[PDB]
Amino acid sequence: GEIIYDGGLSSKLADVVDKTTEPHNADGAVKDGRIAPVKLDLEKQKLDKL
Amino acid sequence: MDVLSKGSLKELLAHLEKTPLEEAISYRIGTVPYQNVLISRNEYYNQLYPDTTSLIDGVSREGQRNVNGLIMSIISYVVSGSGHYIPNIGFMLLRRSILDILTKHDTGLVTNNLNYGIIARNLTVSKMNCEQRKRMLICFKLLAYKDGNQNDYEIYLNQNIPLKQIAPNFIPGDMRTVIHNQDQLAIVGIPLTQSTELSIRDDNAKSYKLGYVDWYNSNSFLRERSEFNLIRLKDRDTKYGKLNGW
Amino acid sequence: DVPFVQAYSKFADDNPRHLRVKTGGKMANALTNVIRSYYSINAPAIVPQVEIDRLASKATVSGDMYNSYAIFNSVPIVEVLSPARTTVSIVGSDRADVTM
Amino acid sequence: DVPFVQAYSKFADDNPRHLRVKTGGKMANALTNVIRSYYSINAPAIVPQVEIDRLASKATVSGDMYNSYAIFNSVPIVEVLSPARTTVSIVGSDRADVTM
Amino acid sequence: ANRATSAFLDNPHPVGVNYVDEGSRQFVAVAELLASKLIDSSRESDESNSDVPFVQAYSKFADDNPRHLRVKTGGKMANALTNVIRSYYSINAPAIVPQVEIDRLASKATVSGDMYNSYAIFNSVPIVEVLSPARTTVSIVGSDRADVTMLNTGAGAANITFNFGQIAETVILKGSVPFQLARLNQPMPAARFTYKLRPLDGPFIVVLPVGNPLVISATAATRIQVPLAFNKALVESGFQTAMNDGLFDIQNVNYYSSFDEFIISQYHAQDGINRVSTCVILGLALQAYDQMRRALPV
Amino acid sequence: ANRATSAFLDNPHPVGVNYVDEGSRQFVAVAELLASKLIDSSRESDESNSDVPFVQAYSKFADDNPRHLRVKTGGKMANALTNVIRSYYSINAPAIVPQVEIDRLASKATVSGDMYNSYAIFNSVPIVEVLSPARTTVSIVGSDRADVTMLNTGAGAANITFNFGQIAETVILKGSVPFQLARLNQPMPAARFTYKLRPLDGPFIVVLPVGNPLVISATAATRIQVPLAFNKALVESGFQTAMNDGLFDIQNVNYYSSFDEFIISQYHAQDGINRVSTCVILGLALQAYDQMRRALPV
Amino acid sequence: DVPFVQAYSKFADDNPRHLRVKTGGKMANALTNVIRSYYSINAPAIVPQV
Amino acid sequence: ELIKVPTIPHNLVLIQSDNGKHALIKEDLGQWPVETGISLVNQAGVFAVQLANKLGIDKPFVLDAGSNYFTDTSFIDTRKYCTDGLSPREIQKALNRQRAYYDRPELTISENKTLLSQSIIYPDADGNDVSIIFSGAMSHAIFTYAQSQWNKNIIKLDDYIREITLTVPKQ
Amino acid sequence: TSGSIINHANNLNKVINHVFADKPLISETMLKILTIDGTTGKDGYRNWLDKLVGHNYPVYVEPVVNIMNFISARFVADSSYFGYTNEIMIMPNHINVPVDDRFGFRDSPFCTSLPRTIMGNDVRRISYNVFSMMEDIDDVISEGFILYDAYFNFSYDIMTTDGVTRLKEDILIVTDTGNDIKPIHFYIYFENRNDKKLRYESKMNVSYRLYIKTPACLLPLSDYMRAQHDYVSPSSSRVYIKDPAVVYTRS
């Protein structure tokens, strides 16, 4: 007989990244208007500029 | 700790099917259930803080050897995380799962004479939050449909109007009701400061809340080491020796 | 109306509307219900935990109810013991008059 | 709320506002005082004619008060004349009952 | 002394207390809006000689496409509307409509459930009590227009005290012959045909001369907060339809000739403000019932 | 039968009929706003060791630059505020503030004249009448907390009728010893220490035994619509200041110990709604008067 | 006046004129006559079927 | 200098299915990105100027739309048919297709005439010409409010002279 | 306090740099007045602006300010007209939620109002910040929730053919730092009500659905009388005078 349903494109709820990501704000449907997170080189095992 | 994190009727029912009765019961004597005691809460008061012990505190208490005692221990485990001390239950009952004790006739337990009003009083339903009352009504409804006492469940609900408002909307026989249920029964969950609460129930509940974040990560490896080469206890095959005292 | 629209939106999670009535939204209902629950043990106590947690995350507060004190002026007279042929009457709660 | 905002602005000559009573504006005041004047000749006539003319320019309609007809049901009994032996009582306005 | 009362103000039965939440008020407002559109579609269907506009309106109202072999009752919305009308009237009528059904039907249209954003004038005249001395006969007849007939058989003139309650806003009295009326301890004025009174002023004294009987016609007007969609003509028609259809046949209930009497009598009673709040919601339900039944007779 | 009545409910006097229109209400609101900022600038100037905040605030209020060797009276606004307060209290007081002056002062700030946006709770206890049979003594003392002393010298128990009016919302009765109270034509409950009653429920009958005196303490709460800037503590301070300053001295006026008693007594008299509307405006004016006089004594 | 002229033309089957009396035309006459016929059995019932 | 606007911005688009069963009208005012975590009113002001520029109401203006009309061929009809806004012919076609799907009779001549005469221009007592057109709600509200604000600064020449008559010297 | 002083200085520079870029807001005339002492015009304006903070000088509200205040108010009040919303709902496909059936869309993502209760129980509400920080999102999303406390920008195109209504991208993206919602774009198709293939595709292929409040820009064709609006154009007899001067320059 004629084929009515033979599957199709399947929508996925989630996109799970497999790579470690740097901290970030919202950039999709929600756009964070605040300043992006500040990166600080805080903990140093050896003195650099002191 | 695992039974308190379940936030859906589907997850709570799935957990009860997997969990044997052994974790619902406890092997520690505890103290008498109802008693006026003075407890020390030095974070707030220099004097001893009055309180009343109950079966909702996550602490083991003595329970009688009857169907009422077993039912009370099961409900306390669901609504509080810790069961009660019922002496010498027996291998046959301990290997069965919690749901089969509530909803199946092959366990060997008679539950036709259960009085729902007395159980709620003994479990101190007055000092229960919305989530705990819903879980108690789920266990009551399962027992009611198991023994055919569906009318008595409605009579109990009619006598207690506040419980009728928050009653679950699922029929034990049907599965469409469980799939489409939208209740929120979670008690513990990932969010609270490391502080002490005045009540025994509030303090013990907060202890579970603070320990859930740590339990989320540490239980995986420690569990797998325990039953690396161990036979599952649930529905374990045996010679079916005997059921004594029931 | 800009200052009031911002404040009402934060409180009620919805913009004010001219035709609709201003009730405060879900936060008003939750506050009303917990007041009933606080008064008596027979109150329904029908506010879900998930609703409370989402409403406590709007602002940052400690929730500590023990960092100060207040003075309450009610005078407690538990019992007044009088012998025969004596009349004693107590009137008032903020200032108690004992007529003997 | 856009349709109500436009309608009220045309009627009242000011935009609707939260925290305001939404009275109706100058047109409401003129209508109220005009009603007082029509009922009695002792009522003051305080609305300027310039204000009335300005408000009448908001919409385009004819001032015809004689376009059509209406039917009013009050029964006028101007007089009932009866002899000395009889008694007559008239009761009612929409339906007049005369007991004889 | 002898006391006389209006018939419709005696023993108001308690009203229902079930469907008064925010969701229930939304459902009643949605029913009124959808039923009005249904009756408009039926008129348009007749004019255009096509059933297409009516089918679209019925599907929205009844959540099912109309079928020729079926009877077109109205679907779940009609059944829910009928049961809430029963529950509103009396406290003994059971509430059989689940809350999940009310919420689902409330989402068919977006309307506010504000039932106190407008007003309506009601014409039932409340006469709480008329106290008369001995040898005087006083009879009260009427609800929309109260005629009070007084006959004096005593030696001298009598003083009859009228009490119109504290709820009515204005009362207008017109007599067959001129008479004198005044409040307690005010000087009696000259004989005058028509009096305008505010009931909050207090009891009013009518001096009754000896002779031919004096009949006073009483007309009142009171203001009750109602939703803006309220239409008094539709509510009165809906009240008769519900009464005729046996929706108010419950034991230990009192019956009234009009919805005006029902709301006013329920207002001159204990917890009058709360009772009237439920009555207003019932009126909007009866407005939807009238429209829906005239479009879909059964 | 003996009748007992609260002292502050007897013979209220007529209130003013001027300075009620929209422009006048704007003037009172502007005066309250400007007076409040004056007292805040007084505190800020002390903390910051500079007179700039006070000079700016006083210049706005008085339309004049503050100068040394001046009394700092407050300018035209203070004179307008004082004369307007006199007008409200009595209908006999003259209205000597031109309308053009009020409008000019109302233009110093952009605020709404709405005086019914919010509400306030007023604590005066209205006891309209207490009816007692013979052989019994009844005494009523107090306004904020009314104590009713009751003694029965008769042979048997007596029934005594309480009437709290219709304006009050709730009334709480506390007895020295447990007593019995119920509405008319209702069964008597068991002896109880406390009762919560709605005054609209009707007259209340209390059973007085023969043994020992019974004292009943009454507390009532009444809701009156007020502007959002209303502050009861500040209004009370202004009321005592105006009385001490002699703004309330005129022929044929009752005198009250608090604004609580003033507004409640005016409510319970005939034509209650309009009197409370004027009294609320007097409260905001009194609130402004207190802050301006405490910032600028004279 | 166009909306009234067109609506009157359908009712009366005649264009309105400034120097002529508007009475509803033929439809007004037939409507008046059928009202007379409905009230009593002694009415003439004059308007034809065509 | 005053800007004389010839046409009214309506911003209306008609979307209909191929079957013809369903049709709808949409206002297209564009897409405006909003950033979370900062004040919404501050972003609204920036977008307000762009919206005003899009509608043509940023600079002072008056509307000249009284000449945008035509006249029907019927001798009885002396009305003026406005050419602004969404054309009534487009709505007629959309309704026309909808009836074709439902196997319903087509729109009648009388029904066509009523629909095609919905957009009209008529004069008021003051001499102004009012145009009734099919247009979006938001565009109408913003456009009309802008007209009210600008017309406050348009006065008669004799009224302007009276204001400045005390500043004119005698030389 | 040091924080207040630092905050004021940074803000002052940001304003000054903005008002002097492109065509300056401030005219050359007053820059001459402030430069007369030798200081740079940019520096002089910064000094004058600081002095003006906290002034009580009355400023007349001009017509252009009134117009923009009106547009700003309607931007906040009616967000759906401009393509953003403050609330979205994610539900599994097997949960039946009431939607807007006026337009005849297939599986319409538009609801008249986001439901207060579903299946007799109130719908959970989670803020975006808490949602982003969640680690048990899989358990929570199984029951469906409502996301608020953020401004969600959405787009849609209505296709005249019939097909499976869906989103351009996945609903959410899960990273080791946090969870986010991908840009929202709806492909909306009209429904034939009798196509078995499309009924099966919608029920089984798509497992989760996103719902937003119905945009107010949309209006069914049946209600075309709601777009009827009036506009007033002044009379054509008026003449506008460019130079309203009343006198000439001669003795």
Automatic annotation (TrEMBL), chain A:
Positions in coiled-coil regions: none
Protein name: Vp2
The organism of origin for this protein: Banna virus
Highest classification ranks of the organism: Viruses, Riboviria, Orthornavirae, Duplornaviricota, Resentoviricetes
Residues of the full protein shown: 52 to 101 of 955
UniProtKB/TrEMBL annotation, chain B:
InterPro entries in the record: Seadorna_Vp10
Official protein name in the record: VP10
Native species: Banna virus (BAV)
From TrEMBL, chain G:
Taxonomic superkingdom: Viruses
Descriptive protein name: VP8
Range covered out of full length: 52 to 101 of 302
TrEMBL record, chain H:
Name this protein carries in UniProt: Vp2
Organism: Banna virus (BAV)
Boundaries of the shown chain within the full protein: 182 to 352 of 955
Superkingdom as given in the UniProt entry: Viruses
